[model samples]
Target: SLLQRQDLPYRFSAVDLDSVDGQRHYRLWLGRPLQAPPAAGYPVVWMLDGNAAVGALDESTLRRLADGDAPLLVAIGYRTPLRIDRAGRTFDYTPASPGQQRDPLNGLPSGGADAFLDLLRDGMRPAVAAQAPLDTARQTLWGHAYGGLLVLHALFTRPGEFARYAAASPSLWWRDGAILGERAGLEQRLRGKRAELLLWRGSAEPASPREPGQAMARLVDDLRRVAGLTLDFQPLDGLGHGETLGASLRLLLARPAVE
Candidate 1:
């Protein structure tokens, strides 16, 4: 009865959040128990690229999150992989998009990472709150590739937006390191913010011309001087970009005590 060992704790339904056009309906992917012992609350890990995360997290671990291992998995379901991943995130994830002249697909036309997070705060969050049993206090935004960049962007710009941020092989070279050079600017903006960030890029990750973990390391170093901002870096020594994420999942989920 391993397959049925645990009752499903998530609601597999659809819901709509207000969008620019009118209603942006999402295939709400959740993890709720089939039955409840006491209905324990769990941290919310909002995973992008719904399909991949859902597939990766699987049912057991996800259910256990509701049952209590890591945390509840509330993956933001996507309608299509390419539209959201290749297209939507391509622009939305970056800190400052240069525009269509450089990158062929996303030349800074649509990204709006800040704008998108605004949408989440203004629109999607309420709808999600109404449906899902989540702990926004322990919320973490996770992604990879360009999505990884989005995760870092959240950390760099709105450091306090999410409690923890995890990204595997982020595209640091994107937009000519606009996010990198703006530390002082972000510093001034984050006057009295509270935040925690978890960033890791594989040593072998073919991230761009930029060295993996170098720029982000310096960035993290600068933020270390600031109060209420924290960071961690990993080289993924025997692993490449695709292979390193598995290791990160095991380690990053747990929080370390603040000194």
Candidate 2:
């Protein structure tokens, strides 16, 4: 592709970072404005599922969203662009739990959320920092599906890392609803903290009352009253689980720039 070409306003680098167990290859993408960066630096947004974000998120869309000005877009993905490394994502994006289901057909491994987050916080963030001048107070994380599930976990566990979080159709039902149990203690952590989160779901998804999306809505509702978090929920009619990401990318970029 056209999407993966080098002619865009972004540059791509293939870097390898040391993980707790070993090293893993990552394809990193960085986009910049035509003019110089602001003195205070641009807000940095991390796209978790690199392939989809880079493929679907276009400059025109972001430009229109920012009214001709765009923030620093950093996409952290695996070396393979057309298709992500499924095994890697499965291990990196899920929380640790025996209850986590194994893929019946593919038998993918789950439960590595903490370690992956550590890599991003320790290894990836520093790398990005070394290259770009970022607004320290305004960092955002955007993820979908299992990646979105990890975003929710990060928000509850390491809330200070990012000022804004956009989780599209997170797999809330993972580990037999284990993530929901995190609510009891999360309230205290966010009692006085200030952050923004947007939860989105597609209407054509699960209609069952206990679907992850419905549960997530309840969680957001509960977090709204006790936590100092600003939350938004968007139920996209006629869309399905996989389509929510496109909608999220649109709305997240379309929102007014943070002051």
Candidate 3:
């Protein structure tokens, strides 16, 4: 496992995945699910914030909730060196079409996210299981900002991957809401599936030059009519985009022991 960079109390493992085409490489960082002082089965929570949720999900206050004390946490994050320019990341994490400025970086083709999600199930999850104790049934995903976009996209496309999700300030404005079209074919893609979605956006996030929050309203509206789904939307009135990661994860995984 390449995750040996740190010596935290938790277990650490690494994975190099094959994309949908089964050719490219996607990096995964897995934080060892802790046994805590006691010990139990581990429910997995996948987290994406390199700035906050990564290996640190269980380092302090967050660890209490993450350790089956509240919920189980895997705390997966992107590995670095590759993070410079972050090619593999841009390829999988961004949507297919450009949302705002038609910015080439955040544009289409990357919207081929179905492939990246595939990498999660086919590649990352298996690797994590090989390295630690994880409860397959209680899977949850946590993403912030652009990573948040991945959450919304995954719900409609591969709802089977995880039961619960947390998205903070998602770039729902992606491709002028073109991502909705991707979700319309849910019956064909996911076939029969159930998903629980928890989404949050910073009220002040729109004040930034990026204005991701303002664009997210349309995403909320688009999903509003979808049936047989559990969705919750909240405005993190005080927190900024960066601060919403913990709030979103804790809110969704504040459940009984899983890991």
What TM-score, computed on C-alpha atoms, does each candidate reach? 0.76, 0.87, 0.73
lDDT of each: 0.59, 0.74, 0.61
What candidate 2 gets wrong by more than 4 Å, as runs, is 2-18, 65-69, 81-83, 98-106, 207-213
Query: Quick one: best TM-score, which candidate?
Result: 2
Candidate 3 error regions (>4 Å)? 1-9, 16-27, 36-41, 49-52, 55-58, 66-72, 82-85, 97-109, 185-192, 207-215, 221-225, 253-259
Highest lDDT: which candidate?
A: 2
lDDT of 1 by residue, 1-259 (tens): 2223344555454454434543233443554444432244456676765555555554444454553334545556555434244545444555555444234335434556776677767776677767655566677887776677777777766677677778766766776666565455665666676666677767666647435567767766776786666666666777776665555654554444221
RMSD (Å) of each candidate, 1 decimal: 4.4, 3.0, 4.8
lDDT of 1 at 36: 38
**Residue 141 in candidate 2, Cα distance off native in Å:** 0.6
TM-score of decoy 2: 0.87
- What is the Å distance of residue 98 in model 1 from its true position? 8.0
User: lDDT by residue for model 3 over 176-207, one digit each (tens)?
Assistant: 55655667866455456666677887766653
Error (Å) of candidate 2 at residue 121 is: 1.2
Q: Residue pairs in steric clash, candidate 3?
A: 11-32, 42-259, 43-258, 43-259, 58-63, 95-111, 96-108, 96-111, 97-108, 99-175
> Ten consecutive residues with minimal summed lDDT in candidate 1?
250-259
Tell me how far the alpha carbon of residue 149 in candidate 3 is from the true structure, in angstroms, after superposition: 1.4
Q: Per-residue lDDT for 117 in model 1?
A: 74
How many clashing pairs does model 1 include?
Answer: 12
Arrange candidates by lDDT, descending. Answer: 2, 3, 1
